């Protein structure tokens, strides 16, 4: 509506702006109820697909992985390398930016000190072991997964990571020219 | 200008806008709706008259005999409302109608009358509505909420392009009757008209036309236009039809009229019409696409040259030319304006005649059966057009005619061929582009049906069954000596009516939390229910707030949850139109002056006016002040010149309901919080002593009085007698109705249970020898204080954190609040002990109970029933009953113990009524219901004796009043006929009989009066006998039960942590601590604070209305404090008068004006006494007090205009920095008490088939451990917790007793086993054909 | 089953079963009369309908209805759906040793403990109290212990304080969206009837103090107690499992 | 059709 | 089945149109079928006739006398000791289905509220075991011959 509500709540809304206020509030409450129901259904399906997955080994031994690098959407970078790579296990050696000598050997859990080293050497290319590329059959290995994120250490054999993944994805669900270089 | 009940406490008003319309009677919808039902209507169109005149007369098959309707009436209900509630029976009246069975003769042509028999037949009892809009059905009060349903008529709607990706829109037109079938037309993505009859398979639309005896030629003539050609090869042309793109430009007048290829333009048409062009020549091939209109045959051999609706080709042109045809008629069908939609429907139509169409309809409607001419014809003619099987009600006819743009507002209730044809034409127009579809959620398309209408519908439904039965009986026998009473049974009609009133979705237990909840329950509108949409199948379009709700439905008050927007409340001034549409009042504006005559406008009617807003400044003469006034036109709002407005709003409250008009400073609260505030305000519990709001809106008195809780005077008079239980008023001589004694009595309702187990109690608010006027309140119901609604208490509040004891929404409460019983409530509950008869022998209620060591039998009297007044606690025996049992088959060890100690067996159980654990009240009432063949032990006789005493007393008083009235009449109409001046009292009463005075016109009738006196005496002897027999009659208990004893317990609940409190601005919380009084913050005067609230709850919720209330509350209390001081130092009335008069005239030209110069010193001092706890103040909804006026009123006291003072810490005595906001806020105690919410269990009763714990506090059940909790325990590694919760704790039948024994043996180990639900699953899968087994 | 007042309550299956038998019997009867084949065929069709309605009702035509006007429940309907064996009774049972109440603040608590009402704890821990009473000689038999707890003697409260000492209880709020919606605490006996919840945990549960309620369960076995203490305690769950960030932030 | 009664009638 | 029963037992000699003879047997068969198959707790035919007669007389008395006949009045209008009338009125109507939607919340039904009364409370079983132990101990206190005499007794 082209004419806005110019009165705040310290003043009063007159009887004709309160009607529009009510339009909005009534829409909001119903959309909230919808959000809850839909998120519940998604979470149920997501735990059904992935319930049986468990850590059932300690090292598959594979070398393949996923190349983790900061994600940049056109302009600035909204997710640095630390947040993407923290806690994972390196698949290949991390060479120096000059390619001269290795920085972190291999299969080392990247905790805070290692990430500080990575930032100090200004490296933007780490390859890390992923679940989707795990050799272990009927389960996952503790090194491919990563670390716990709730106990701050490499995950324990036995943990049900599928239920945790489903719940982690599902519970936040209720809460939802020209170029210009800016540096020398 | 102030009523005697309003000169005790005048509430100061800050309203600035004038009042021209008084708030109507609030619950008038219910009363008027039901009054229209049971009411003798001469021109029967309302209620039972309509149903009778519509069903009767029942002409039997062959017309041998017939049954006629004469009249009806309602008898007197056997029990009044109170007796119905006590006894547990419905309050209803018997319906008795006069029927006249007429038997003809089967010999003469007609008009024979062999005989006529008139008889009166009873056909069901109809429940009666009390004088407050409720029904008493089985001892409880029911409310039947109105329903908002789609009006019958015709509605055109599209799917707005949401069924096919093509992007085009499909249009449809539905016809809804009041009862019948739904005839829906629709368009196909291929532009084919289709029709469905009851949401069934589609058919080409034209088929119905064929079923209506229409020929293809006639159909085309109805729908399409004509292009006529003559032969050479000349076409008649009208300039406008070639509106356009021409293959051949023109041949007119020879030379030229327009060039080929170029598109026809407006100037071309203008020149063509100017020249008056009629006929031209065009290429023969140009006529190779057009469609012929009618059939063309050859005269040589009578052969069909070309059929109607057949494509025209060159060869067919040649055949017609050689067949002597000159005139050729085709259909004009362009692409934009006139489309060829019926021609394609004819193409796809297989049927060719009426019979084929009827066969197709019959095959589609009821497949399987072979079609038949007779059956198909009957089915079609009976689908519509038939009175009994189809009705398009008067409202439906009105909307049908008004939608098809007809001037006739009345007509037949059945369809016709014209109606269907016109609806099809309208749909075709909508498709072409001339017209608009309807809005479904418009409040001009939705009407309201209330109790009377629904009840009439169900009564007619029953009457139809009775009609069928009567016809069937009259079919056979055909005997004489048959009265109109063996053919009618009350079971069907009474069954339908009882089903509606007792067990229906729209009839529900009344809300008796407080007066507001009752009022807002009665005036409620529900879209759900029979005949209305369900909840799951309702997307957020009917749930929205349409612009047509402005003044008819409340935008705020609506439940939040599954049905939000499906249940809403009637607005304050809205009333229902004659046809059932909501309408609202507007004050009419002439040329420039705002007149005083109000018109009620409807939703559709209101569209084409411009209505000025309520808060539009007016001159002293009625003229508008501003040149441009902000008013809302058809759909939107904007500025309009003062010279083009014709209506104005009648008030600023008319947009909100009664619930939301009680929230002060509603403009400053967010809409979400206002919604919550109204919803919670309906839930407050009445407290021990009522406390009027210090800050209100002026709607309190209307709500309190228009509800039935209070006792209001019927006629003026002087209070002759007052008491805790009755008020006797001595009417004025101006309202005497000379036949009357002249006094009226009001019997107050003392402590009684409500639907919610709360207390209902009326206490007088008048005093002996005090004047009253009609309309004044004589007694205060629950939650009213001197006639004003009072739902809570005004507490002294401070906004500050204070140590995390109000962390999220918790509330910190002083102990002086608890000491003073400010939020103490009374709850009354009834417990029943039923003694039945078993196959082993009847149960007996007795004081000799086995295995009771005589300690618990102290409260029980000699008959085994607790004493009245006894203070009981959990586990105490209320009624002592025992049940016989068998032999019990002792174990080999109990035998040894019995042999050692020689203890004997019982042979009777200990099934007795005992107080449920955790409840501690006093017994306030016991009542016993015995069967008609039982002994009536001593306690029942004692209860009967006291009842007889009370009844005799009451009847005696009523008889004496009647006798006094009759003797006063003897005196007044015998003031002549014998001089007796001093003898007025010399003779005894049985002799003011023969008084008199100087002969005059007031002589006449001693014989008549003496006869009437004896008649009264004998009548009241009969009345005494009737009430005695009604007291002493046995009850009709449910079969098998010998007797019942009901005990009423009155508990008094105090306030404690866990109880939920709230204000009016949607701000709620749970009490967290009861702080000692010396730990609360205090100010430099020493006064502590009652409650400490959190300031972090305001900013994020934007419900700052509460803050203003607090500020204003402080101001109000300040005034009271000042008065109190002047009233404690015994100041002379001059100073008190000066101050109170100064405080009643503040603000900027407010409307309210109170002149204390006209108050006698007694009046002023009584007012000052009522104002010493704070001066009440009114802040109407959208024109309230402004912040400047609050500051000014604070200054009138001695308070700081900031509203903030400096507070000290009770614990340390150090002052809090940065002063805090303290004031007075009105707090409510919601009906969510932690007493009713705490629950625990370790072991109890288990279900029957799947042996798991039952559910519910009442059943001592367990807590669901659902799927989500199982996932949570799987996310952890907790595999032993999960296993114990799945087997040993729930349904591992022999693994849970082992666990119990292990626990009591100090060994914490489980031997789980397998749950008993998996075994049920295996047996049920195996009881199908499958073979599921456990492999080893 | 017999209800109070000489009135029975029955399952729908009985009804359905009866149908079958009736029609079946009639068929066996009809074949003994050598009836015309039209009647026997009609009876066989009716028997097929009866058996089909028994096994799965409302799937081969119209659903048979009871004395009410709602369809009967068949063997197939007793297994499927949210109100069926699998969903409602094999995953989602109700539980003993459980209670619920309204939660308040209690800002004095430590992160690992909660406030539990005396009246609730005297009910959840009843067998443990019986064991203690009969083990310490205060009660001669289990019946005597039941009497003592019913009367609420003075020693009962001391035995209760001794039984609750180091015995976790699981608290749960109804929408368990993630695994931090169940947590184990050490009870602290309080007065009143409201549970007291440590403030720093409220974000994990998504709980405010304007009317919310919680359910409390007590683990019985030794393994369940050790799992509550080692896996589910609130002093072990201070990091979120969705991201490594703390979930014990002051609010 | 699906109704046994319909088939019997036929 | 009733038409088939008539046919075999019909005669043209009596010269009575067939429908007249058939209708009686057809109606008799249908009525006996209703008496047998209709109820889940089968009630004999004579008791069914008694109930139907009671209903007819109650209908007549409701239509004529006014409010409703009482068991005493019904017994008077009929001819029974008035204690038989009580039993006939007490004959239970059709059982309530255990799936009747009482719950009106979480789709709860009547069957969820009916407990199992044949179970033994765990405290009862614990007491039984405790009594067994106590009796064992007491008998062990006594000598052997008397112990076994009591045990076998
Ligand atoms: C003056 C006109 C007035 C007499 C007309 C106008 C609309 C009519 C009502 C509506 O049709 C809706 C209902 C239809 C039912 O079938 C019969 C009852 C019902 C309330 C009608 C009674 C009556 O007929 C009404 C009030
Ligand atoms: C009506 C809303 C659903 C539910 C509350 C209604 C629907 C039918 C009601 C039962 C029967 O009517 C009669 C039964 C026997 C006695 O008469 C009283 C008890 C009895 C079990 C009733 C309990 C309850 O009242 C029922 C289940
Ligand atoms: C929503 C809560 C309804 C509840 C107040 C009332 C309404 C009808 C009551 C049931 C019926 O009487 C039928 C049974 C009678 C037997 O004695 C065993 C209990 C039984 C299931 C009753 C339990 C409870 O009392 C019910 C559910
Ligand atoms: Mg909350
Ligand atoms: Zn791996």
């Amino acid at each position: 509506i082209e004419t806005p509500i110019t009165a705040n709540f310290r003043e009063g809304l007159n009887v004709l702006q309160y009607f529009i206020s009510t339009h909005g509030a009534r829409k909001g409450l119903a959309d909230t109820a919808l959000k809850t129901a839909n998120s519940g259904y998604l979470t149920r399906r997501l735990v059904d697909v992935a319930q049986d997955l468990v850590v059932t080994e300690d090292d598959c031994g594979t070398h393949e992985g996923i190349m983790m690098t900061p994600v940049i959407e056109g302009g600035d970078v909204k997710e640095p390398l630390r947040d993407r790579v923290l806690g994972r296990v390196t698949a290949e050696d991390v060479l120096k930016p000059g390619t001269a000598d290795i920085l972190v050997p291999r299969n080392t859990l990247l905790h805070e000190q290692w990430c500080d080293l990575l930032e100090e050497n200004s490296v933007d290319a780490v390859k890390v072991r992923s679940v989707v590329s795990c050799d272990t059959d009927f389960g996952v290995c503790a090194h491919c997964y990563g670390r716990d994120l709730a106990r701050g250490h490499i995950i324990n054999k036995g943990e049900a990571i599928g239920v945790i993944a489903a719940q982690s994805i599902g519970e936040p669900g209720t809460q939802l020219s020209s170029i210009q270089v800016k540096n020398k | 200008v102030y009523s005697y009940t309003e000169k005790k406490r005048i509430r100061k008003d800050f309203g600035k806008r004038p009042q021209v319309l008084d708030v109507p009677y609030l619950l008038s919808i219910q009363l008027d709706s039901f009054q229209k039902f049971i009411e003798q209507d001469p021109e029967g169109q309302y209620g039972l008259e309509a149903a009778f005149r519509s069903v009767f007369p029942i002409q039997s098959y062959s017309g041998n005999s017939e049954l006629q309707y004469v009249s009806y009436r309602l008898g007197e209900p056997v029990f009044d409302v109170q007796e119905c509630q006590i006894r547990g029976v419905t309050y209803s009246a018997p319906l008795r109608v006069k029927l006249r069975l007429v038997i003809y003769e089967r010999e003469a042509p007609e008009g024979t009358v062999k005989d006529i028999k008139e008889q009166e037949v009873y056909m069901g009892e109809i429940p009666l509505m009390t004088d407050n809009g409720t029904f008493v059905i089985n001892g409880t009060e029911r409310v039947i909420v109105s329903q908002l349903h789609r009006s019958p008529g015709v509605f055109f709607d599209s799917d707005k392009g949401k069924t096919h990706s093509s992007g085009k829109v499909l249009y449809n037109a539905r016809i809804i009757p009041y009862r019948g079938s739904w005839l829906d037309f629709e368009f196909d993505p291929k532009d084919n008209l289709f029709v469905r009859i009851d949401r069934r398979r589609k058919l080409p639309a034209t088929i119905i036309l064929r079923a209506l005896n229409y020929t293809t030629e006639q159909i085309l003539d109805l729908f399409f236009e004509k292009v006529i050609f003559e032969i050479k090869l000349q076409m008649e042309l009208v300039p406008e039809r070639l509106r356009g793109t021409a293959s051949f430009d023109i041949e007119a007048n020879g030379k030229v009229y327009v060039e080929k290829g170029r598109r026809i333009t407006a100037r071309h048409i203008r020149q063509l019409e100017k020249d008056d062009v009629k006929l031209i020549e065009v290429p023969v091939e140009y006529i190779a696409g057009k469609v012929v209109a009618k059939d063309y045959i050859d005269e040589s051999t009578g052969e069909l040259i070309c059929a109607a609706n057949m494509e025209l080709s060159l060869d067919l042109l040649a055949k017609l030319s050689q067949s002597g045809h000159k005139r050729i008629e085709t259909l004009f069908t362009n692409d934009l304006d006139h489309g060829p939609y019926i021609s394609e429907t004819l193409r796809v139509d297989p049927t060719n005649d009426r019979l084929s169409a009827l066969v197709e309809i019959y095959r589609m409607m009821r497949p399987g059966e072979p079609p038949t001419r007779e059956a198909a014809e009957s089915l079609f003619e009976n689908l519509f057009f038939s009175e009994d099987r189809y009705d398009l009600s008067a409202v439906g006819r009105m909307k049908f005619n008004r939608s098809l743009l007809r001037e006739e507002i009345e007509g037949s209730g059945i369809l016709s061929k014209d109606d269907i044809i016109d609806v099809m034409k309208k749909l075709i127009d909508i498709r072409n582009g001339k017209g608009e579809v309807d809005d479904i959620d418009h409040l001009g398309n939705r009407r309201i049906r209330s109790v009377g209408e629904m009840a009439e519908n169900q009564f007619r439904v029953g009457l139809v069954r009775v009609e069928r039965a009567v016809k069937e009986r009259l079919s056979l026998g055909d005997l004489d000596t048959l009265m109109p009473q063996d053919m009618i049974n009350a079971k069907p009609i009474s069954a339908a009516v009882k089903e509606f009133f007792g067990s229906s979705q729209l009839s529900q237990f009344m809300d008796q939390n407080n007066p507001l909840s009752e009022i807002t329950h009665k005036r409620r509108i529900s879209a759900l229910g029979p005949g209305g949409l369900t909840r799951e199948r309702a997307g957020f379009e009917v749930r929205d707030v349409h612009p047509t709700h402005y003044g008819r439905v409340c935008p705020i008050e609506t439940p939040e949850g599954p049905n939000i927007g499906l249940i809403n409340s009637l607005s304050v001034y809205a009333q229902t139109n004659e046809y059932g549409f909501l309408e609202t009042p507007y004050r009419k504006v002439t040329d420039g002056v705002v007149t005083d005559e109000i018109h009620y406008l409807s939703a559709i009617e209101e569209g084409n006016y411009v209505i000025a807003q309520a808060n539009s400044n007016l001159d002293e003469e009625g003229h508008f002040v501003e040149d441009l006034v902000t008013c809302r036109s058809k759909g939107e709002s904007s500025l309009f010149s003062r010279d083009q407005v014709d209506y104005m709003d009648v008030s600023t409250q008319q947009v909100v309901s009664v619930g939301a008009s009680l929230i002060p400073f509603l403009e400053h609260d967010d809409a979400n919080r206002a919604l919550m505030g109204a919803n919670m305000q309906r839930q407050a519990v009445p407290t021990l002593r009522a406390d009027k709001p210090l800050v209100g809106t002026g709607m309190e008195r209307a709500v309190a009085v228009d509800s039935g809780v209070t006792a209001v005077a019927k006629r003026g008079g002087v209070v002759q007698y007052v008491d805790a239980s009755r008020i006797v008023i001595k009417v004025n001589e101006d309202e005497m109705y000379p036949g009357e004694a002249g006094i009226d009595i009001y019997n107050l309702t003392k402590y009684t249970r409500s639907n919610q187990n709360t207390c209902i109690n009326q206490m007088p608010c008048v005093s002996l020898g005090e004047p009253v006027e009609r309309g004044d309140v004589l007694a205060d119901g629950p939650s009213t204080d001197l006639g004003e609604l009072a739902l809570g208490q005004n507490m002294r509040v401070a906004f500050m954190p204070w140590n995390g004891y109000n962390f999220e929404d918790s509330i910190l409460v002083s102990e002086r609040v608890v000491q003073e019983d400010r939020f103490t409530t009374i709850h009354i509950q009834e417990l029943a002990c039923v003694s039945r008869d078993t196959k082993l022998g009847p149960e007996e209620i007795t004081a000799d109970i086995p295995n009771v060591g005589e300690a618990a039998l102290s409260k029980l009297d000699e008959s085994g029933i607790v004493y009245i007044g006894a203070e009981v606690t959990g586990g105490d025996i209320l009624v002592g009953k025992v049940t016989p049992k068998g032999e019990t088959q002792l174990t080999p060890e109990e035998k040894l113990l019995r042999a050692i100690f020689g203890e004997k067996a019982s042979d009777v159980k200990d099934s007795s009524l005992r107080v449920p654990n955790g409840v501690s009240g006093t017994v306030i009432d016991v009542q016993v219901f015995t069967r008609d063949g039982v002994e009536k032990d001593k306690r029942a006789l004692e209860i009967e004796e006291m009842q007889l005493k009370q009844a005799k007393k009451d009847l005696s008083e009523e008889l004496q009043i009647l006798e006094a009235g009759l003797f006063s009449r003897i005196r007044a109409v015998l003031v002549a006929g014998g001089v007796e001046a001093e003898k007025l009292d010399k003779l005894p009463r049985d002799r003011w009989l023969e008084l008199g005075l100087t002969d005059e016109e007031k002589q006449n009738q001693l014989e008549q009066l003496a006869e009437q006196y004896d008649e009264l005496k004998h009548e009241f002897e009969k009345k005494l006998e009737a009430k005695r027999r009604k007291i002493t009659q046995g009850d009709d208990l449910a079969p098998g039960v010998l007797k019942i004893v009901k005990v009423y317990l009155a508990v008094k609940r105090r306030i404690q942590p866990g109880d939920k409190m709230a204000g009016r601005h949607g701000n709620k919380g749970v009490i967290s601590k009861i702080n000692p009084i010396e730990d609360m913050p205090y100010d430099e005067n020493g006064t502590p604070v009652d409650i400490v609230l959190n300031p972090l709850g305001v900013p994020s919720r934007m419900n700052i209305g509460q803050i203003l209330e607090t500020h204003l509350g402080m101001a109000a209390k300040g005034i009271g404090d000042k008065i109190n001081a002047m009233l404690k130092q015994q100041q002379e009335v001059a100073k008190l008068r000066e101050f109170i008069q100064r405080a009643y005239d503040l603000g900027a030209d407010v409307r309210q004006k109170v002149d204390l110069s006209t108050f006698s010193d007694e009046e002023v001092m009584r007012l000052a006494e009522n104002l010493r706890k704070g001066m009440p103040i009114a802040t109407p909804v959208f024109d309230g007090a402004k912040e400047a006026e609050i500051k000014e009123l604070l200054k009138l006291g001695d308070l700081p205009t900031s509203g903030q003072i400096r507070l000290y810490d009770g614990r340390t005595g150090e002052q809090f920095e940065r002063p805090v906001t303290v004031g007075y806020m009105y707090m409510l105690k919601l009906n969510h008490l932690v007493d009713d919410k705490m629950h625990a269990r370790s072991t109890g009763s288990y279900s029957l088939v799947t042996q798991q714990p039952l559910g519910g506090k009442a059943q001592f059940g367990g807590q669901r451990f659902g799927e989500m909790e199982v996932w949570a325990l799987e996310a952890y590694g907790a595999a032993y917790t999960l296993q114990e919760m799945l087997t040993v704790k729930s349904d591992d039948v022999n693994g849970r007793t082992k666990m119990y024994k292990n626990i009591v043996d100090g060994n914490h180990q489980m031997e789980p086993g397998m749950p008993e639900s998996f075994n049920v699953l295996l047996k049920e899968i195996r009881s199908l054909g499958i073979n599921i087994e456990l492999e080893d | 089953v017999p209800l109070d007042g000489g009135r029975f309550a029955t399952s729908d299956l009985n009804d359905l079963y009866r149908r079958v038998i009736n029609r079946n019997n009639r068929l066996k009867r009809l074949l003994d009369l050598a009836a015309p084949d039209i009647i026997v065929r009609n009876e066989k069709r009716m028997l097929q309908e009866a058996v089909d309605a028994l096994l799965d009702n409302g799937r081969r035509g119209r659903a048979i209805t009871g004395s009410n006007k709602r369809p009967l429940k068949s063997l197939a309907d007793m297994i499927k759906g949210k109100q069926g064996r699998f969903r409602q009774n094999l995953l989602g049972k109700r539980v003993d040793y459980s209670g619920r109440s309204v939660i308040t603040v209690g800002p004095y608590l430590r992160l690992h403990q909660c406030g539990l009402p005396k009246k609730m704890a005297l009910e959840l821990f009843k067998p443990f109290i019986y064991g203690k009473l009969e083990l310490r000689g205060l009660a001669t038999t289990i019946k005597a212990a039941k009497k003592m707890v019913e009367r609420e003697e003075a020693v009962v409260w001391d035995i209760l304080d001794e039984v609750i000492r180091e015995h976790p209880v699981l608290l749960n709020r109804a929408p368990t969206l993630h695994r931090l919606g169940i947590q184990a605490f050490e009870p602290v006996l309080i007065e009143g009837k409201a549970i007291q919840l440590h403030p720093l945990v409220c974000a994990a549960y998504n709980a405010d103090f304007d009317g919310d309620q919680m359910a409390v369960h007590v683990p019985l076995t030794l393994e369940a107690q050790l799992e509550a203490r080692a896996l589910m305690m609130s002093t072990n769950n201070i990091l979120s499992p969705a991201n490594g960030e703390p979930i014990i932030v002051p609010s | 059709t699906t109704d046994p009664v319909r088939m019997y009638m036929r | 089945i009733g038409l088939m029963k008539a046919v075999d037992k019909f005669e043209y000699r009596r010269g009575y149109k067939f429908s007249t003879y058939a209708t009686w047997w057809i109606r008799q068969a249908i009525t006996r079928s209703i008496a047998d198959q209709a109820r889940t707790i089968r009630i004999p035919v004579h008791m069914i006739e008694t109930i139907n007669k009671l209903n007819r007389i109650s209908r007549q008395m409701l239509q004529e006398m006014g409010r409703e006949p009482t068991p005493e009045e019904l017994a008077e209008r009929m001819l029974m000791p008035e204690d038989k009338i009580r039993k006939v009125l007490k004959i239970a109507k059709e059982p309530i289905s255990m799936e009747t939607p009482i719950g009106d919340d979480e789709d709860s039904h009547l069957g969820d509220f009916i407990e199992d009364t044949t179970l033994e409370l765990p405290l009862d079983s614990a007491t039984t075991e405790s009594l067994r132990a106590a009796t064992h101990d007491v008998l062990a206190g006594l000598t052997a011959r008397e112990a076994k005499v009591l045990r076998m007794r």
Side-chain angles (χ1 to χ4, degrees), chain B residues 421-527:
Chain B
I421 292 297
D422 206 336
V423 174
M424 301 237 293
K425 286 180 170 182
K426 177 59 177 299
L427 181 55
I428 293 299
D429 292 15
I430 295 287
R431 174 54 176 81
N432 288 337
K434 300 185 177 181
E436 292 300 339
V437 306
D438 288 10
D439 200 337
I440 300 302
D441 301 327
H442 210 262
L443 270 194
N445 299 329
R446 298 207 280 175
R447 60 171 256 109
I448 290 193
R449 47 160 55 147
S450 295
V451 199
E453 184 169 323
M454 304 151 74
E456 176 183 1
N457 290 10
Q458 305 306 322
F459 185 79
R460 188 183 186 282
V461 163
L463 218 56
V464 151
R465 268 72 132 163
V466 163
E467 176 187 38
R468 175 167 55 182
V470 163
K471 281 188 295 185
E472 184 159 341
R473 172 56 183 85
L474 280 176
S475 176
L476 285 305
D478 318 11
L479 298 104
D480 207 332
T481 180
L482 182 64
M483 295 292 179
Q485 193 173 21
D486 326 8
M487 312 182 296
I488 290 177
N489 48 336
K491 174 261 184 176
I493 320 188
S494 190
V497 163
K498 182 56 169 196
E499 171 64 7
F500 171 64
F501 278 101
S503 298
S504 173
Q505 182 165 12
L506 287 180
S507 92
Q508 14 191 341
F509 276 72
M510 189 167 65
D511 270 330
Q512 291 200 282
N513 272 306
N514 51 83
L516 212 201
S517 62
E518 302 164 6
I519 288 295
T520 181
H521 197 1
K522 285 166 195 172
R523 35 155 44 203
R524 174 183 291 178
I525 311 303
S526 185

Side-chain angles (χ1 to χ4, degrees), chain A residues 57-62 129-131 133-136 139-145:
Chain A
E57 206 174 357
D58 198 1
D59 190 328
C60 58
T62 189
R129 309 176 68 175
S130 178
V131 178
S133 69
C134 191
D135 277 332
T136 298
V140 171
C141 84
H143 276 69
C144 294
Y145 182 73

Side-chain angles (χ1 to χ4, degrees), chain B residues 622-652:
Chain B
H623 283 81
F624 285 98
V625 161
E626 289 181 0
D627 185 1
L628 291 78
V629 51
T630 166
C631 61
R632 59 189 176 90
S633 184
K634 307 191 183 302
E636 47 174 310
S637 46
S638 64
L639 290 299
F640 286 66
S641 181
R642 76 171 72 172
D643 295 346
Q644 67 163 341
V645 306
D646 29 24
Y647 285 99
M648 182 177 176
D649 287 27
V650 95
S651 180
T652 72

